[PDB]
Amino acid sequence: ELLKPRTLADLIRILHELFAGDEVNVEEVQAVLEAYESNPAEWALYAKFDQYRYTRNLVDQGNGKFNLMILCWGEGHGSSIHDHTDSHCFLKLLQGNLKETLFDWPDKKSNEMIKKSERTLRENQCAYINDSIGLHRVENVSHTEPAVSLHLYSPPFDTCHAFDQRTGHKNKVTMTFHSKFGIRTP
Numbered sequence: 001e002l003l004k005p006r007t008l009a010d011l012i013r014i015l016h017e018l019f020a021g022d023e024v025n026v027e028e029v030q031a032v033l034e035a036y037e038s039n040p041a042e043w044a045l046y047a048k049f050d051q052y053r054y055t056r057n058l059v060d061q062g063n064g065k066f067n068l069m070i071l072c073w074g075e076g077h078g079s080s081i082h083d084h085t086d087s088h089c090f091l092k093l094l095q096g097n098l099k100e101t102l103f104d105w106p107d108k109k110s111n112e113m114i115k116k117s118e119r120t121l122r123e124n125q126c127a128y129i130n131d132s133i134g135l136h137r138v139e140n141v142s143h144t145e146p147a148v149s150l151h152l153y154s155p156p157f158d159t160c161h162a163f164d165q166r167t168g169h170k171n172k173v174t175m176t177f178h179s180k181f182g183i184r185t186p
Protein backbone atom coordinates (compact mmCIF):
# COMPACT_ATOMS: atom_id res chain seq x y z
CA GLU A 1 0.00 0.00 0.00
CA LEU A 2 1.19 3.61 -0.52
CA LEU A 3 0.41 5.34 2.78
CA LYS A 4 0.47 9.06 3.55
CA PRO A 5 3.90 10.04 4.86
CA ARG A 6 3.47 11.40 8.41
CA THR A 7 6.80 13.22 8.45
CA LEU A 8 9.86 13.80 6.24
CA ALA A 9 11.58 10.80 7.86
CA ASP A 10 8.48 8.70 7.08
CA LEU A 11 8.53 9.92 3.47
CA ILE A 12 12.21 8.89 3.16
CA ARG A 13 11.34 5.41 4.58
CA ILE A 14 8.54 5.04 2.02
CA LEU A 15 10.85 6.19 -0.77
CA HIS A 16 13.40 3.57 0.10
CA GLU A 17 10.54 0.96 -0.27
CA LEU A 18 9.44 2.38 -3.65
CA PHE A 19 13.06 2.27 -5.01
CA ALA A 20 13.83 -1.22 -3.58
CA GLY A 21 13.66 -2.60 -7.13
CA ASP A 22 15.23 -1.69 -10.48
CA GLU A 23 12.35 0.24 -11.96
CA VAL A 24 10.36 3.29 -10.80
CA ASN A 25 6.62 3.74 -10.69
CA VAL A 26 6.62 7.44 -11.52
CA GLU A 27 3.00 8.07 -10.66
CA GLU A 28 3.30 6.37 -7.25
CA VAL A 29 6.47 8.32 -6.40
CA GLN A 30 4.82 11.60 -7.42
CA ALA A 31 1.70 10.81 -5.38
CA VAL A 32 3.67 9.99 -2.21
CA LEU A 33 5.81 13.15 -2.58
CA GLU A 34 2.68 15.25 -3.03
CA ALA A 35 0.99 13.54 -0.05
CA TYR A 36 3.73 14.62 2.42
CA GLU A 37 2.47 17.89 4.01
CA SER A 38 5.54 20.17 4.19
CA ASN A 39 6.48 20.78 7.83
CA PRO A 40 9.27 23.36 8.09
CA ALA A 41 10.56 22.07 11.46
CA GLU A 42 11.41 18.76 9.79
CA TRP A 43 13.52 20.24 6.99
CA ALA A 44 14.98 23.42 8.54
CA LEU A 45 18.32 21.59 8.97
CA TYR A 46 18.66 21.43 5.19
CA ALA A 47 17.32 24.88 4.29
CA LYS A 48 20.74 26.56 3.98
CA PHE A 49 20.51 29.55 1.71
CA ASP A 50 23.14 31.54 -0.19
CA GLN A 51 22.57 35.22 -0.91
CA TYR A 52 23.66 35.03 -4.55
CA ARG A 53 22.28 31.80 -6.06
CA TYR A 54 20.18 28.74 -5.21
CA THR A 55 21.79 25.97 -3.14
CA ARG A 56 21.54 22.14 -3.38
CA ASN A 57 21.42 20.34 -0.01
CA LEU A 58 21.69 16.55 -0.02
CA VAL A 59 19.24 14.87 2.36
CA ASP A 60 19.41 11.16 1.47
CA GLN A 61 21.46 8.99 -0.92
CA GLY A 62 18.77 6.49 -1.50
CA ASN A 63 20.97 3.41 -0.93
CA GLY A 64 22.39 4.39 -4.39
CA LYS A 65 19.10 4.33 -6.35
CA PHE A 66 18.27 8.03 -5.99
CA ASN A 67 19.52 11.36 -4.56
CA LEU A 68 16.95 13.25 -2.43
CA MET A 69 17.92 16.91 -1.91
CA ILE A 70 16.49 20.28 -0.86
CA LEU A 71 17.06 23.35 -3.04
CA CYS A 72 16.83 26.80 -1.48
CA TRP A 73 16.00 29.68 -3.83
CA GLY A 74 16.48 33.24 -2.61
CA GLU A 75 14.22 35.95 -4.03
CA GLY A 76 14.89 36.11 -7.76
CA HIS A 77 17.15 33.09 -7.89
CA GLY A 78 16.75 30.81 -10.91
CA SER A 79 18.35 27.95 -12.80
CA SER A 80 19.70 27.58 -16.32
CA ILE A 81 17.61 25.88 -18.99
CA HIS A 82 18.78 22.34 -18.33
CA ASP A 83 18.27 18.61 -18.92
CA HIS A 84 18.29 15.75 -16.41
CA THR A 85 20.91 13.28 -17.67
CA ASP A 86 18.55 10.43 -18.58
CA SER A 87 17.13 10.36 -15.02
CA HIS A 88 13.71 10.74 -13.50
CA CYS A 89 13.33 14.10 -11.73
CA PHE A 90 10.61 14.94 -9.19
CA LEU A 91 10.31 18.42 -7.73
CA LYS A 92 8.01 19.12 -4.76
CA LEU A 93 7.49 22.57 -3.31
CA LEU A 94 8.16 22.76 0.47
CA GLN A 95 7.79 26.57 0.73
CA GLY A 96 6.92 29.39 -1.65
CA ASN A 97 6.36 29.07 -5.37
CA LEU A 98 8.55 28.43 -8.42
CA LYS A 99 7.89 29.21 -12.08
CA GLU A 100 8.76 26.28 -14.40
CA THR A 101 9.33 27.12 -18.08
CA LEU A 102 9.33 24.18 -20.52
CA PHE A 103 11.48 24.06 -23.67
CA ASP A 104 11.84 21.56 -26.46
CA TRP A 105 15.22 20.04 -27.22
CA PRO A 106 17.05 22.41 -29.67
CA ASP A 107 17.65 21.49 -33.28
CA LYS A 108 21.13 21.69 -34.80
CA LYS A 109 20.71 25.18 -36.30
CA SER A 110 21.54 27.92 -33.82
CA ASN A 111 18.17 29.51 -33.07
CA GLU A 112 16.46 31.19 -30.20
CA MET A 113 14.88 28.61 -27.89
CA ILE A 114 11.20 29.53 -27.56
CA LYS A 115 9.29 28.43 -24.45
CA LYS A 116 6.72 25.73 -25.08
CA SER A 117 4.74 26.49 -21.91
CA GLU A 118 5.04 27.70 -18.34
CA ARG A 119 3.39 27.10 -15.03
CA THR A 120 3.53 28.13 -11.41
CA LEU A 121 4.32 25.26 -9.03
CA ARG A 122 2.79 25.94 -5.60
CA GLU A 123 3.41 24.76 -2.07
CA ASN A 124 3.16 21.00 -1.68
CA GLN A 125 2.67 20.31 -5.38
CA CYS A 126 5.00 17.74 -7.01
CA ALA A 127 6.05 18.11 -10.64
CA TYR A 128 7.91 15.55 -12.75
CA ILE A 129 10.24 15.84 -15.72
CA ASN A 130 12.55 13.66 -17.75
CA ASP A 131 14.55 14.16 -20.99
CA SER A 132 11.78 12.60 -23.11
CA ILE A 133 9.38 15.36 -21.89
CA GLY A 134 11.83 18.19 -22.66
CA LEU A 135 14.08 20.77 -20.92
CA HIS A 136 13.14 23.28 -18.25
CA ARG A 137 14.19 26.36 -16.34
CA VAL A 138 12.94 26.75 -12.72
CA GLU A 139 12.93 30.26 -11.15
CA ASN A 140 11.88 31.88 -7.92
CA VAL A 141 10.40 35.02 -9.46
CA SER A 142 9.25 36.31 -6.07
CA HIS A 143 10.71 39.59 -4.78
CA THR A 144 9.71 38.81 -1.16
CA GLU A 145 9.47 35.05 -0.44
CA PRO A 146 12.31 32.48 -0.56
CA ALA A 147 11.24 29.13 -2.03
CA VAL A 148 12.37 25.69 -0.84
CA SER A 149 11.91 22.59 -2.98
CA LEU A 150 12.50 18.86 -2.45
CA HIS A 151 14.00 17.10 -5.49
CA LEU A 152 14.41 13.33 -6.11
CA TYR A 153 16.54 12.15 -9.06
CA SER A 154 16.81 8.53 -10.06
CA PRO A 155 19.41 7.34 -10.94
CA PRO A 156 21.51 9.93 -9.09
CA PHE A 157 23.51 12.28 -11.34
CA ASP A 158 25.97 15.02 -10.67
CA THR A 159 26.49 16.42 -14.17
CA CYS A 160 23.98 17.90 -16.67
CA HIS A 161 23.83 20.45 -19.50
CA ALA A 162 22.84 24.07 -19.48
CA PHE A 163 21.44 25.49 -22.68
CA ASP A 164 21.88 29.02 -24.10
CA GLN A 165 18.39 30.35 -24.72
CA ARG A 166 19.67 32.48 -27.62
CA THR A 167 21.30 29.64 -29.62
CA GLY A 168 20.37 26.28 -28.12
CA HIS A 169 24.07 25.58 -27.54
CA LYS A 170 24.70 23.46 -24.48
CA ASN A 171 27.58 23.10 -22.06
CA LYS A 172 28.27 20.41 -19.51
CA VAL A 173 28.01 21.53 -15.91
CA THR A 174 29.10 19.71 -12.72
CA MET A 175 26.79 20.26 -9.91
CA THR A 176 28.04 20.48 -6.39
CA PHE A 177 26.32 20.15 -3.01
CA HIS A 178 26.16 23.18 -0.72
CA SER A 179 25.62 20.76 2.19
CA LYS A 180 25.21 17.01 2.86
CA PHE A 181 23.15 15.59 5.75
CA GLY A 182 22.84 19.04 7.31
CA ILE A 183 26.63 19.72 7.13
CA ARG A 184 27.95 22.61 5.02
CA THR A 185 30.43 21.20 2.47
CA PRO A 186 32.53 24.10 1.15
Ligand code: NI
Nearest residue numbers: 082084089136
Ligand atom coordinates in the same frame (compact mmCIF):
# COMPACT_ATOMS: atom_id res chain seq x y z
NI1 NI B 1 15.50 20.52 -13.35
